[PDB]
Amino acid sequence: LHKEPATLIKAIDGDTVKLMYKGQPMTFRLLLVDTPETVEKYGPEASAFTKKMEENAKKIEVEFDKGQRTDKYGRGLAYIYADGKMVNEALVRQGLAKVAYVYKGNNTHEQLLRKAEAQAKKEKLNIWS
Numbered sequence: 001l002h003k004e005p006a007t008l009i010k011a012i013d014g015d016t017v018k019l020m021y022k023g024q025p026m027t028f029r030l031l032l033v034d035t036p037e038t039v040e041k042y043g044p045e046a047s048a049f050t051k052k053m054e055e056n057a058k059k060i061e062v063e064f065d066k067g068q069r070t071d072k073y074g075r076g077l078a079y080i081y082a083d084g085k086m087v088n089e090a091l092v093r094q095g096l097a098k099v100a101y102v103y104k105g106n107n108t109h110e111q112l113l114r115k116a117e118a119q120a121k122k123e124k125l126n127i128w129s
Contacts, residue, residue: 003061014046029075046096057082067105095125
């Protein structure tokens, strides 16, 4: 997998963000994460977390996996990086999201995320409170 540059347009919530990708605006859905919807418990926490991480970043990069690249709603399915730090992973590690079921072969980082989740659970962080 290879990372590509992107520019933040607008943070929508915990699991979705609008980015300028290859010259055009596009909505992306973060791969392998399930964040509380915004209003479920920790929903606003997850949203603020993602928003702060994305808006303060110098560089935003998108990384598509090896499976299908867009869901039924036209959203791109990818791992998002803020200054080299994967947002998908940070959310799970901080206990603000759970690892979702693999979707159409997009599982390159499933183990990485599963381990981050086990640690958040052991630390009883937020959702695991």
